[PDB]
Structures are given as structure tokens and as C-alpha cells.
């Protein structure tokens, strides 16, 4: 099965993902799909996008990153932006549209020089910079 390998955005099955993964009977490359029906174009052009067509790369600051990485440089699991536990903060999606603050995805909503970071799931460490390679590297 193949839904595991998809960036799923809720509120917006395995057969669909499988037939999208093989590109079986498809006149194009299947970049995204809805649960089903497929597209040769993603949101960058329940929604599920192929992580192959989600740039796992950034330029300098990386303000337009949208990957699914959710680990810190220290290797700590990021805390969901919806959660205030362990750490409370003012980073609601309503305050930040299109910056894509869902689940525990590494992000850099304000173009920090650090690059994208996350709130750790470790109470003692509030926030840490996720280790993400640039394309140029």
C-alpha cells in the first residue's frame, strides 16, 4: 500500500494511491490526487501529494518550503502547530495563510536566517532548527 508516501492535507483510498504510484493507465505523471481522482499538477501549480513532486530542497532562507520533514538537527520530533503542549505560541494558521503550518512540518514563516525550524516535542527545548539541505549543496 501507498498512502504512507503521500503528503495528505485533510478536509480538502489505498486503491487511489496505488494506481497513482504505479501510474497505471495514466496519460501523464500523477503528481497529486483526491479521495478517487488524479492530477499531473499539485497545489504548487482530502488532498494527497506525491513527495517526489514536493521540493525537498530550499534556497537561502527557504520561506516557500513545504516538505514533510518533521525532525530537528538534534533529532527531536517536532510538536504540532495546533498543539500548545508542551509549548504555547502564537502561530495559528489563521495568523499565517499559505505558509502551511500543519501537523509538525518544519517551517520558516518569517524568513529567519536560521532556515526552517520546529517546536520540539521535548518540553525543555522550545524550538530548534531542522536540518534541511539546500539545492546548491
Amino acid at each position: 500500500n501507498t498512502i504512507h508516501e503521500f503528503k495528505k492535507s485533510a478536509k480538502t483510498a489505498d486503491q487511489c494511491a496505488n494506481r497513482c504510484t504505479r501510474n497505471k493507465g495514466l496519460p501523464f505523471t500523477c503528481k497529486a490526487f483526491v479521495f478517487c481522482l488524479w492530477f499531473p499538477f499539485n497545489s504548487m501549480s482530502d488532498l494527497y501529494e506525491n513527495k517526489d513532486y514536493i521540493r525537498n530542497c530550499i534556497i537561502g532562507k527557504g520561506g516557500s518550503y513545504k516538505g514533510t520533514v518533521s525532525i530537528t538537527k538534534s533529532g527531536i520530533k517536532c510538536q504540532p502547530w495546533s498543539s500548545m503542549i508542551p509549548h504555547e505560541h502564537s502561530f495559528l494558521p489563521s495568523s499565517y495563510r499559505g505558509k502551511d503550518l500543519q501537523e509538525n512540518y518544519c517551517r520558516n514563516p518569517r524568513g529567519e536566517e536560521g532556515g526552517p525550524w520546529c517546536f520540539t516535542s521535548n518540553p525543555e527545548v522550545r524550538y530548534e532548527v531542522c536540518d534541511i539541505p539546500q539545492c546548491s549543496e
Epitope: I85, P86, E88, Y127
Partner: antibody
């Protein structure tokens, strides 16, 4: 050695205005909620306002909302509680605190006395 | 607005004894509750956050539980130093943040 230190607490006449300052040492701002919490002599704690350093967004308690306002200088790791139209009910020790629901860090507090 | 009713006013116990303190809310809060300790001349100390999450450095004898509108705080093995006033607090990004009236804890001796 992450610290919060309050200053500005003094004796004021009723109806006058006063500015308290909290300065943080040994940590990034950053990234945090800064709340003020006061405590009248022999009474309990009363939260009165917060600001998000990054957001700049402020929220004040009803007992205070009309007349108090909170600002910051992130570069200097400083928060300003700016009080107006002080009444006797405002007499309390004022705490600069790190957080809104989870307050890991507290200042020792600065004592404001509204009197003639 | 939001009312946090904290009962009782005061509780007593001897060393090793156990004490339980209640906090009840006018509205639901959904595990957004915190417990603080304060001794005179000092600022409060954070004990519990979430409803159950124990702040680092704090003895395991302190127990937080509850959800919706019903919350409890139980100090199980009680030392002399536990003599303080303890407060329930709920804080949310918005709107607001509010404390309880507090509860005084005496050590029977």
C-alpha cells in the same frame, strides 16, 4: 541563568500614570508570550495582560483593559507595562512572567502603591 | 468571562500525608490547565501544565489530573516544604488567562 527583572515600581498618586519595565537576561525572546501578573497585598494572583513578542498582539483583562497597555523592544529583550488612571485597587506587586498558560519563568516582582 | 472556582480555601496534613485540591471551570478548557505553588515573599513556581504534565525538576508526589471542567491536584507524600499556597490557572493564546482564588496548605505538626 535565564532571568526576568522588573523595575519602575514606586509610590503614585491616584489618577496618575506609571511605566514598569521587565528586562530578560540569558535567553532568546523570542518566540514567547510575555504576561504581567499582579498580586494585591494578602490577596491572590490576577493575570492582567500579555503580549506575543513575535506577533505584537496584546490581550488585557477587563479589570485593566481600558487603561493599561503592553509594548516590547525585542532587540533589547524588554517589555513595558504602561499604566494610566491608577486607582487604589491597582496597588499590588507586579510580576513580569514568561508564558500565558505555562509560566516557567517569573520575576521577583516590583511593588506599586497607589496612594496620596 | 471564565470563572475558575478553586476549593477548598485551606487544607492541612502532616508529613507523608496526602492533600487534594479541586479546580472547577465555568466553561470547558480542554486540558489547558496549570498548577502553581507560591511561598510568601516569592514569585510562584510552575508545577503542572496541560492538566497532567509535570514541569521538570518538580517531585513526582505532585499529581495533576482532570479534563473538561473538573481538575484535581494531589500531593501524595508531603514534606515540610510543601507548605505554601497553590493556584489553578488556565491560559489560552486568546482569549484570556485566569487564576483561581488559591488554596492554603498547612503542615500538621
Amino acid at each position: 541563568q535565564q532571568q526576568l527583572v522588573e523595575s519602575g515600581g514606586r509610590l503614585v498618586n491616584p489618577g496618575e500614570s506609571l511605566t514598569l519595565t521587565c528586562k530578560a537576561s540569558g535567553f532568546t525572546f523570542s518566540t514567547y508570550y510575555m504576561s504581567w501578573v499582579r498580586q494585591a497585598p494578602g490577596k491572590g494572583l490576577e493575570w492582567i495582560g500579555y503580549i506575543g513578542t513575535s506577533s505584537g498582539t496584546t490581550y488585557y483583562a477587563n479589570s485593566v483593559k481600558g487603561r493599561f497597555t503592553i509594548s516590547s523592544d525585542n532587540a533589547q529583550n524588554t517589555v513595558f507595562l504602561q499604566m494610566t488612571s491608577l486607582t487604589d485597587s491597582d496597588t499590588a506587586t507586579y510580576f513580569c512572567a514568561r508564558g500565558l498558560g505555562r509560566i516557567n519563568l517569573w520575576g521577583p516582582g516590583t511593588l506599586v502603591t497607589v496612594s496620596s | 468571562e471564565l470563572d475558575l472556582t478553586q476549593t477548598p480555601s485551606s487544607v492541612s496534613a502532616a508529613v507523608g500525608g496526602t492533600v487534594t485540591i479541586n479546580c472547577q471551570a465555568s466553561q470547558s478548557v480542554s486540558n489547558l490547565l496549570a498548577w502553581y505553588q507560591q511561598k510568601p515573599g516569592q514569585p510562584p513556581k510552575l508545577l503542572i501544565y496541560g492538566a497532567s504534565n509535570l514541569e521538570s525538576g518538580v517531585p513526582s508526589r505532585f499529581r495533576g489530573s482532570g479534563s473538561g471542567t473538573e481538575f484535581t491536584l494531589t500531593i501524595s507524600g508531603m514534606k515540610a516544604e510543601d507548605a505554601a499556597t497553590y493556584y489553578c490557572q488556565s491560559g489560552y493564546y486568546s482569549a484570556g488567562a485566569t487564576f483561581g482564588a488559591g488554596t492554603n496548605v498547612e503542615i500538621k505538626r
